[model samples]
Target: MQIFVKTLTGKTITLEVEPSDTIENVKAKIQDKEGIPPDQQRLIFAGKQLEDGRTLSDYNIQKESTLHLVLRLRGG
Candidate 1:
């Protein structure tokens, strides 16, 4: 199934995802939309930030759920 993805740029869409897809993978998936790197993508659900290494299923994200994608400015 798919979940709703809200980007930092006020963009929203139904993102195709799998339970096994990690947070990073979700970023990769959204790359199809525009262009956002995994390292720069941040996902938060229910006010809690999601780690890129963790799977979406670990977050217990179900159908019709919204994954707010916030971008970050990487510093050296």
Candidate 2:
């Protein structure tokens, strides 16, 4: 399945993934393509956080589904 991911900067990227692919796997691909570290990525789909261990189908994600990506912030 193909998924659409939007970054905080309004940049969109399309990823080709399998329904059985875990959210963590998607994060890794995002990191590889966008230079965003997986640890700093927070993906939201259907207004819910995408958990690492859960597969795309587990969340009922469909082809061309859009996911919002937020960067985790850490500051003193």
Candidate achieving the largest TM-score? 2
User: Could you estimate the TM-score for every candidate?
Assistant: 0.72, 0.86
Query: What would the per-residue lDDT of candidate 2 be over residues 6-47, giving only the tens digit for each residue?
Result: 887898898888999888887788889888687777888888
- Name the regions of candidate 2 deviating beyond 4 angstroms: 73-76
Q: Write candidate 1's Cα lDDT for 1-76 as tens digits.
A: 8777777678788867788887777667778666755666666798888776888778777788877777876688
Model 2 C-alpha RMSD to native: 1.6
Cα deviation at 5, candidate 2, in Å, is 0.9
What C-alpha lDDT do the candidate models reach, one value each? 0.75, 0.83
Best by lDDT: 2
